[PDB]
Ligand binder design. Structure first.
Ligand code: CLA
Ligand code: CLA
Ligand code: CLA
Ligand code: CLA
Ligand code: CLA
Ligand code: CLA
Ligand code: CLA
Ligand code: CLA
Ligand code: CLA
Ligand code: 1L3
Ligand code: SF4
Ligand code: SF4
Lengths: 103, 78, 80, 746, 31, 31, 61, 39, 148, 78
């Protein structure tokens, strides 16, 4: 609805927390990380708790760019995923890439 | 002096070990927490609403401080 | 936003881009060292000022300097 | 988010930091947006006009409240019994006990008992009516109105002046020494000869009759013919002397004699009008300050003082550092001459006024000194140019800054190691039942200064002795009468000495130098030695912190480019070891505690020495000041008794219950400081993040939103708020003690 | 006594809260 | 003898002149 | 300035200003602004003891 | 260098205790002076 | 007799403090058994205290009013044992410790040896510490080191 | 006794607030998402994002020691 993934990305299985999005994601900006997993594997949320990512492309909406970057560095340091793309999402739905810029 | 000193000593040793309890629960959280072990259990679901716990603790701490020490300050003032 | 400057004392040790939790910095080719590269900051609007790139910089005095400036939502680190 | 308009960088902050930093950078006019140097100096000039008028409206308040609801004319009928009254109380929170407690006998309601010495001031300067207090109130309100109208006038573009008018410094020095310091001293001498001296001796002179009544009956013919001495004689048909030099204190009032005040304000007025003739203005003659400063060179200081004219003149922070250092040294001198030589009648017997006034001026003096060295460090970060100051004395004390910091370090550890060791030794010796093994050092040198001053000190003598009348010093070998007698019988007067027996020069005794309380120089001993070394430790460690903050403000080995980060910044982060409290603001911040500790030791000393005098128990000071349980018990525990019994369940309240409440208030504010000082930022940021979550999810309440985002206070702000609470609690706790312990002596 | 107590109510209680409301309007409105 | 209400009113007239000049100075300092 | 020569550092912002270190390697590329690697007996505040300096910032003792 | 007594805590602490014992026997031998007796 | 200080020979309050403590001792000996380790320690304390007041007597310690011994520091040879002699004893032993630690640093120049004290380089540093002026005066007259 | 026991409830609850906020926010927060990689015992993550002073769980043990002192001192004074 208000937090809709791009087509091609499936949601990871998470029972939803209280560390996540607030009114700023409705009104100013939010951030979106998409990564590619080969299997279903258990990762720590940057906002508290644990989630399971399914095989395929997983997308997750976070309030800050550092939460997405910490999730990406945890995916590198534990589960060896290096194709996370971090986007900046405006409230009108315009999409821009912010990590990596170089390619 | 035995009564004052035994009560006072065992109170202080008790308070020190409770702060150590909080210390090693935090040290477990940094070092020995595994997301692979704790899915949807009591320990994982506590982290999942930790803002609610700490904010409600913040409110009851404010309530207790007003409704005990402001009574003492009222008694000072009157 | 905080202002990030990289001087000519940089040796291209690839440590300030790994220690950054925000991806402010990147490596461009350069001619003044053995490594062939210098750090640069094209994304200073996302910098929070956390000084992790200055803890990791291995020179005498730090080749990168972040200056604390005007504060925003991103630079105060707010999730709200 | 338009506030603050003077900083666009602050205005686009979306958090609560915007308001706090707009308040805190409101008077840093140099760092504001679009600020030029002309606009800087003219806004500072009008701010000064506004502040001078705040001082005058504050001064008019005293006159109005004592004329409207004081007891001044009732206090002239009996100055020794009935207490001065500040103003009356309207607080609707009072119950019946406090309403009758702050009401005096014969009064019709609750009032504040004045502890500032204004009645003694107004008696000595010759106010005898509430109507004169009322015309003083009217004149100060209109003089404030004139100064606000002048500031308003000088922000209009015909009367705004130029930077050349601000940076002249020749005409400014000439006119301040001539008119501001000299003509006003001459005018106060004229007031003392016309008004205060004849209203002391009955003869009341006011604004209707001042043109007809002369101050001396050989009037203005003794001026021009060279017979100046007839003002110092008793003269014919009345005419008490208006220009005289008794010296010391007056016996009959216990205060300074008024003719000596008038002659002082004549003489230093003449010296200040001559001193304002030195510098070069538009008549050709004078000293130009650029060639006068830049011509001080001798070959141990290199380039000498070249370029220091522009260094002082273009930098307002150097000028304000000198002004605050001089003004605080003056304010300490004010505090230390008011107890020593009291200037106003019946002030020395009002003990708590002397306590409150000394402690007032000394704490304010410590503030002005720490602000002087603060603006020294601010000069170092913002205004110092190494190339305009090539090899002058300022660059050399930047060059060997390591020596000054390490030697202040050595003096501070020297003093603290040995003062603490002798005090803790004295504690151990009184603990082990052995007060005659204490290390007890008679202050030989300060008693020797007393001996050349005129105090006996019966094994010490002046080096050049006394003259043939045995009261004049050998170092003042003229004037047998005029000031051997007055100064000698002042500095050896007081109770306990100059008794009826004597056998030496104190046999004379009939001028009245035994009805004075306290000697002019107090007797001193080993506790006085030890607390003077504690005072020296406090001053030296405060100078260490401040000189280290000034000289390391540009850069060090740990942070070489510190001046690019300004005066007040938090740190440079946890790297290279960690850099907490690195800024020169942080050395202001840490010296502030040491200043409060220093001035605590100074006023603790003044208070216990004087309360031991006032309770006739100087043996308690001389026995218990050498060790520190004596300071805890016989000063702090013993004199707390009328303070903490200001109110209670079993005795009904008295007039000291407000000081009791303010004592506990200051304890609360002081310890509330400790929260901001010990607990630091990231805890409070994470706590406020939980509070943000709690507010946006509570229904009936998430519909109310902030416009500035709730954040924790900054690092420098957490330090500054903890320091402000520490300092407010310090001053209110000690003001409560130093007034309630002494007003509750009885 | 010689008290204007209504003036104490105005300038110590009403006018400070007046002033803080006016300063709130100064510091929270855009232009 | 204390001060009556008429002279307090005269002091308030003087303070109104002072308050007007303060109000002018504070606003032109605010420019 | 060759391998194993004691040098004094003339850089003002250095930790090792007026301190003497050992030259470990000199870079032979002329494009390098600071080619001379100096190792020190004392470390800085980040527990490191090597730096690259230039030629003009070093004094031979 | 010897085992366990060459360490700086041990050498420093035995220096502290040895100085305090030599000082205590000096105070016992001199009958606890405040000054050096000249007469 | 200097200012607010007279010596012990004509001091009344020193004589009062002395008699008060000697009579308190005589009452504490006279109420106890002489073979129970309390009384011989009190007689040792009695003999020690009589020697201490005789010591305060004969070398001129100095009192007034509160009767306790005040010490005079400006360099009199009559009161030379107050300052001048424990001054040069302090200079001797503190210069011994400072010169021993300084010479230990000059001979070691090693980081293991500051936490593991080599006694063969520490105790001769202490012995030349016991004669430090003869080794420290010509190095003041020579000069130490050029640093800024 | 009512008022002193509510003082006691206040001081126990604030010591709980400090140590439990150390425990549950040991690993991550909205401020520092990667706090577990910084460890249990770190000083801060810099003066940026406003300043992260005493954000470690160790520092919550550090603050809870003073608050335990407060708690046990009022218990033994009562
Ligand atoms: C005496 C000093 C002092 C005071 C008053 C406080 C007060 C407080 N602390 Mg603190 N703290 C202190 C020292 C102090 N601390 C020190 C030294 C440290 C360093 C270790 C800390 C570290 C610390 C931490 C880490 C935490 C606190 C928390 C709190 C809050 C607790 C909640 C509560 O008590 O309810 C009510 C408030 C009071 C009892 C304060 C007095 C209120 C008065 C009686 C009411 C005033 C009436 C009215 C408003 C006045 C209007 C006047 C007008 C002119 C303005 C409270 C505001 C905790 C918190 O935030 O929980 C909510 C928190 O986690 N403190
Ligand atoms: C003639 C004297 C004088 C003048 C003109 C200045 C002028 C200046 N100073 Mg300053 N200073 C002085 C004396 C002076 N100072 C003294 C005496 C001290 C020692 C206390 C200081 C220490 C000092 C420091 C550390 C700094 C300055 C700074 C400044 C600059 C900006 C001030 C500002 O914007 O924020 C205004 C100040 C505040 C908002 C602080 C408010 C604190 C209040 C007054 C305390 C009261 C607390 C509470 C309300 C009391 C009520 C208690 C009751 C409820 C019980 C400005 C040029 C700052 C600067 O950066 O320089 C360029 C700076 O960092 N000063
Ligand atoms: C700025 C200060 C000041 C002012 C405005 C005055 C003003 C005045 N003085 Mg005065 N005076 C002053 C300082 C001042 N004095 C000082 C410092 C002394 C001590 C030397 C005197 C001692 C003095 C004497 C002895 C007399 C005056 C007199 C006068 C009045 C006569 C006018 C005249 O002929 O000349 C006049 C209103 C004369 C007079 O008759 O007063 C009405 C006169 O008798 N003055
Ligand atoms: C029982 C008495 C007693 C005690 C316990 C102390 C204890 C102390 N003193 Mg000392 N002192 C005393 C009596 C005492 N003092 C007397 C009677 C004098 C008068 C002569 C002094 C004069 C004195 C000086 C000048 C110094 C001390 C210092 C010290 C501290 C370290 C000294 C040390 O040995 O460490 C080990 C030794 C070293 C680390 C190096 C030796 C340095 C010595 C102390 C001075 C020699 C330097 C030089 C030759 C002479 C100095 C010039 C001087 C005239 C200014 C220490 C806590 C130092 C201090 O206070 O720190 C600021 C210090 O420098 N004292
Ligand atoms: C009672 C509390 C206390 C004590 C003892 C000290 C002591 C000291 N402070 Mg400090 N200070 C304090 C509170 C205290 N401070 C507070 C609350 C603040 C604000 C945070 C400061 C801020 C401050 C600053 C910024 C500085 C100091 C400095 C110093 C040292 C000064 C040297 C000296 O005074 O003489 C001698 C030392 C003493 C009297 C300490 C007693 C040591 C005994 C003798 C050791 C006992 C040995 C035994 C085996 C254990 C000294 C160690 C200055 C410094 O480092 O000078 C060199 C420095 O610049 N202080
Ligand atoms: C710096 C402050 C200071 C100063 C100046 C003093 C000074 C003194 N104290 Mg004292 N004390 C202090 C702090 C201080 N204390 C503190 C902080 C405490 C609490 C721990 C005490 C507790 C204390 C007690 C309980 C007693 C003293 C006593 C004394 C006195 C006798 C010391 C003496 O002469 O021994 C004798 C010196 C000699 C015989 C000279 C010979 C020295 C030999 C040659 C070397 C010994 C020095 C040393 C061990 C180094 C080793 C050298 C090596 C080569 C072997 C002396 C006047 C005693 C006393 O009676 O007071 C009047 C005593 O009863 N103090
Ligand atoms: C640097 C340390 C220092 C400082 C800041 C002070 C400061 C002060 N002292 Mg003082 N004093 C000191 C050391 C110090 N003293 C020493 C080491 C002694 C001998 C025990 C004394 C004995 C002394 C007496 C008897 C008196 C003072 C008094 C005072 C106060 C008034 C000024 C004065 O008389 O100057 C005089 C200061 C000196 C002559 C000493 C200057 C500092 C020297 C140069 C440090 C090195 C001393 C050296 C180690 C001594 C040994 C030399 C040689 C025998 C080996 C003042 C606040 C007076 C007072 O208490 O007021 C009520 C008082 O009359 N002092
Ligand atoms: C930040 C904290 C810090 C810490 C942990 C240290 C720690 C240390 N410093 Mg240090 N220092 C510091 C800050 C610090 N410093 C600062 C800020 C400065 C100023 C720049 C210094 C300057 C400094 C100097 C100049 C020196 C040290 C030294 C030392 C080492 C002392 C070794 C020791 O005590 O055993 C003491 C060992 C002995 C006393 C050996 C003698 C024992 C005898 C042989 C045993 C036989 C005696 C027998 C039992 C009989 C007893 C009787 C007796 C009277 C003889 C130690 C590891 C010293 C060192 O290098 O180590 C030697 C040293 O020279 N420091
Ligand atoms: C070899 C030991 C040694 C020597 C020769 C010195 C010498 C000096 N110190 Mg230093 N210092 C030392 C150790 C030493 N220190 C240690 C271990 C510390 C950490 C506690 C310090 C902390 C220190 C400070 C903060 C200051 C000095 C200062 C000074 C200078 C002034 C004189 C003085 O007051 O001394 C003071 C000495 C102390 C405060 C430390 C007490 C004495 C220590 C414990 C002696 C070390 C014993 C050592 C282990 C003995 C080894 C024996 C060997 C044979 C194994 C002077 C050159 C001052 C200065 O800069 O003057 C301009 C200054 O402010 N020192
Ligand atoms: C316009 C205006 C001012 C309106 C009034 C606005 C209104 C209703 C009340 C006024 C605000 C009040 C009363 C409190 C908020 C202050 C606060 C964020 C405190 C938490 C905090 C503490 C306790 C520390 O110890 C500390 C230490 C070091 C760094 C940071 C901190 C820190 O952040
Ligand atoms: S200060 Fe922190 S966020 Fe900014 S560039 Fe450096 S490491 Fe990255
Ligand atoms: S700035 Fe420092 S950390 Fe970054 S590449 Fe250069 S030397 Fe390495």
């Amino acid at each position: 609805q208000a937090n809709s993934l791009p087509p091609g990305a499936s949601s990871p299985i998470f029972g939803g927390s209280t560390g996540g999005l607030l009114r700023k994601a409705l009104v100013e900006e939010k951030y979106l990380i998409t990564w590619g997993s080969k299997e279903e594997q258990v990762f720590e949320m940057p906002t508290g708790g644990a989630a399971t990512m399914v095989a395929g492309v997983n997308g997750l909406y976070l309030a800050r760019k550092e939460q997405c970057h910490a999730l990406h560095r945890q995916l590198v340091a534990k589960f060896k995923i290096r194709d996370s793309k971090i986007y900046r999402v405006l409230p009108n739905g315009e999409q821009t890439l912010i990590y990596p810029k170089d390619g | 002096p035995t009564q004052i000193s035994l009560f006072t000593h065992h109170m202080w040793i008790g308070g020190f070990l409770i702060v150590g309890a909080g210390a090693h629960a935090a040290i477990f959280m940094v070092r020995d927490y595994d997301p692979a072990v704790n899915q949807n259990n009591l320990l994982d679901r506590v982290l999942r609403h930790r803002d609610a716990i700490i904010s409600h603790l913040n409110w009851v701490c404010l309530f207790l401080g007003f409704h005990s020490f402001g009574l003492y300050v009222h008694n000072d003032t009157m | 936003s905080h202002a990030v400057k990289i001087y000519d004392t940089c040796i291209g040790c690839t440590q300030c881009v790994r220690a950054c939790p925000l991806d402010v910095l990147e490596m461009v080719p350069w001619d003044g060292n053995r490594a062939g590269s210098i750090a640069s900051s094209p994304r200073t609007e996302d910098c929070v000022g956390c000084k992790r790139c200055e803890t990791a910089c291995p020179t005498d005095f730090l080749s990168i300097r972040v200056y604390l400036g005007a504060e925003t939502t991103r630079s105060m680190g707010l999730a709200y | 988010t338009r506030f603050p308009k003077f900083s666009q960088d602050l205005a686009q902050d979306p958090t609560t930091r915007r308001i706090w930093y707009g308040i805190a950078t409101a008077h840093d006019f140099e760092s504001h947006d679009g600020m030029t140097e002309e606009t800087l100096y003219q806004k500072i000039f009008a701010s000064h006009f506004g502040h001078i008028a705040i001082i005058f409206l504050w001064a008019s308040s005293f006159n109005f409240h004592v004329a409207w609801q004081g007891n001044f004319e009732q206090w002239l009928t009996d100055p020794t019994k009935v207490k001065p009254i500040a103003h009356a109380i309207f607080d609707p929170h009072f119950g019946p006990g406090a309403v009758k407690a702050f009401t005096p006998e014969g009064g019709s309601g609750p009032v504040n008992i004045m502890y500032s010495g204004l009645y003694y001031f107004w008696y000595t300067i010759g106010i005898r009516h509430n109507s004169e207090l009322y015309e003083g109130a009217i004149f100060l309100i209109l003089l404030a109105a004139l100064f606000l109208a002048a500031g308003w006038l000088h922000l209009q573009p015909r009367f705004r002046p130029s930077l050349a008018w601000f940076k002249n410094a020749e005409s400014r020095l000439n006119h301040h020494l001539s008119a501001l310091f000299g003509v006003s001293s001459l005018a106060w001498a004229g007031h003392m000869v016309h008004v205060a001296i004849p209203r002391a001796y009955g003869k009341e002179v006011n604004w209707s009759n001042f043109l007809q009544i002369a101050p001396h009956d050989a009037g203005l013919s003794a001026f021009f013919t060279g017979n100046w001495g007839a003002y110092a004689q008793p003269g014919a048909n009345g005419s008490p002397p208006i220009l005289t030099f008794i010296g010391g204190l007056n016996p009959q009032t216990g205060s300074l004699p008024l003719g000596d005040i008038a002659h002082h304000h004549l003489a230093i007025a003449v010296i200040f009008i001559i001193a304002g003739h030195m510098y070069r203005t538009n008549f050709g003659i004078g000293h130009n300050l650029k060639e006068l400063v830049d011509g001080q060179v001798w070959p141990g200081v290199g380039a000498g003082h070249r370029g220091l004219y522009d260094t002082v003149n273009n930098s307002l922070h150097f000028q304000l550092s000198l002004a605050l250092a001089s003004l605080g040294t003056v304010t300490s001198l004010v505090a230390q001459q008011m107890y020593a030589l009291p200037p106003y009648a019946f002030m020395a017997k009002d003990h708590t006024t002397m306590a409150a006034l000394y402690t007032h001026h000394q704490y304010i003096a410590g503030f002005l000194l720490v602000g002087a060295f603060a603006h020294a460090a601010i000069f170092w970060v913002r205004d110092y140019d190494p190339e305009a100051n090539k090899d002058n004395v300022l660059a050399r004390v930047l060059a060997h800054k390591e020596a000054i910091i390490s030697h202040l370090s050595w003096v501070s550890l020297f003093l603290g190691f040995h003062t603490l060791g002798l005090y803790v030794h004295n504690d151990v010796m009184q603990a082990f039942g052995r007060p005659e093994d204490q290390i007890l050092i008679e202050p030989v040198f300060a008693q020797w200064v007393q001996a050349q001053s005129g105090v006996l000190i019966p094994g010490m003598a002046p080096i050049f002795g006394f003259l043939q009348d045995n009261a004049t010093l050998g170092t003042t070998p003229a004037a047998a009468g005029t000031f051997g007698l007055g100064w000698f019988c002042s500095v050896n007067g007081g109770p306990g000495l100059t008794e009826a027996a004597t056998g030496i020069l104190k046999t004379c005794f009939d001028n009245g130098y035994g009805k004075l309380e306290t000697p002019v120089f107090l007797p001193i001993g080993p506790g006085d030695f030890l607390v003077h070394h504690a005072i020296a430790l406090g001053i030296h460690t405060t100078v260490l912190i401040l000189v280290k903050g000034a000289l390391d403000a540009r850069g060090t080995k740990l942070m070489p480019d510190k001046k690019d980060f300004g005066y007040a910044f938090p740190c440079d982060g946890p790297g290279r070891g960690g850099t907490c409290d690195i800024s020169a603001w942080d050395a202001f911040y840490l010296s502030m505690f040491w200043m409060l500790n220093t001035l605590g030791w100074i006023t603790f000393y003044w208070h216990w020495k004087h309360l031991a005098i006032w309770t006739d128990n100087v043996a308690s000071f001389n026995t218990n000041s050498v060790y520190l349980m004596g300071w805890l018990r016989d000063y702090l525990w013993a004199y707390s008794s009328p303070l903490i019994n200001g109110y209670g369940p079993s005795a009904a309240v008295n007039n000291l219950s407000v000081w009791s409440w303010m004592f506990l208030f200051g304890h609360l504010v002081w310890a509330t400081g400790f929260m901001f000082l010990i607990s630091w930022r990231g805890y409070w940021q994470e706590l406020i993040e939980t509070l943000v979550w709690a507010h946006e999810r509570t229904p009936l309440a998430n519909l109310v939103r902030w416009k500035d985002k709730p954040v924790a206070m900054s690092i420098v702000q957490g330090r500054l708020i903890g320091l402000a609470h520490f300092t407010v609690g310090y001053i209110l706790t000690y003001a409560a003690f130093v007034i309630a312990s002494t007003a509750g002596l009885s | 006594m010689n008290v204007y107590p209504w003036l104490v109510y105005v300038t110590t209680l009403v006018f400070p809260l007046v002033s803080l409301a006016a300063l709130f309007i100064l510091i929270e409105r855009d232009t | 003898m204390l001060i009556n209400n008429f002279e307090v009113a005269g002091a308030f007239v003087a303070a109104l002149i002072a308050g007007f000049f303060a109000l002018m100075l504070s606003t032109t300092l605010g420019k | 300035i060759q391998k194993g020569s004691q040098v004094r550092v003339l850089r003002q912002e250095s930790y090792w200003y007026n301190d003497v270190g050992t030259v470990a390697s000199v870079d032979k590329g002329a494009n390098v602004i600071y080619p001379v690697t100096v190792r020190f007996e004392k470390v800085n505040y980040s527990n490191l003891n090597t730096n690259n300096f230039g030629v003009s910032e070093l004094e031979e003792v | 260098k010897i085992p366990f007594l060459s360490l700086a805590p041990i050498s420093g602490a035995l220096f502290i205790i040895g100085s305090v014992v030599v000082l205590a026997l000096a105070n016992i031998y001199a009958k606890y002076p405040l000054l050096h007796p000249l007469v | 007799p200097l200012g607010n200080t007279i010596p012990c020979s004509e001091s009344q309050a020193f004589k009062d403090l002395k008699d008060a403590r000697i009579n308190g001792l005589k009452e504490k000996i006279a109420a106890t058994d002489p073979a129970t380790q309390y009384a011989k320690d009190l007689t040792a304390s009695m003999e020690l205290w009589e020697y201490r007041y005789a010591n305060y007597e004969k070398n001129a310690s100095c009192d007034k009013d509160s009767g306790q011994p005040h010490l005079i520091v400006d360099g009199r040879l009559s009161h030379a044992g107050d300052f001048i002699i424990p001054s040069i004893l302090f200079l001797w032993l503190a210069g011994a410790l400072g010169w021993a630690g300084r010479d230990y640093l000059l001979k070691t120049q090693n980081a293991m040896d500051e936490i593991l004290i080599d006694f063969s380089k520490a105790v001769p540093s202490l012995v030349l510490g016991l004669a430090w002026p003869l080794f420290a005066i010509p190095q003041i007259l020579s000069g130490a080191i050029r640093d800024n | 006794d009512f008022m002193i026991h509510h003082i006691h409830a206040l001081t126990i609850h604030v010591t709980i607030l400090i140590l439990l906020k150390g425990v549950l926010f040991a690993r991550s927060s909205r401020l520092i998402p990667d706090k577990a990689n910084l460890g249990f015992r770190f000083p801060c993550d810099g003066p940026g994002r406003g300043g992260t002073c005493q954000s470690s769980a160790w520092d919550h043990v550090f603050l809870g020691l003073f608050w335990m002192y407060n708690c046990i001192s009022i218990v033994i004074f009562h």
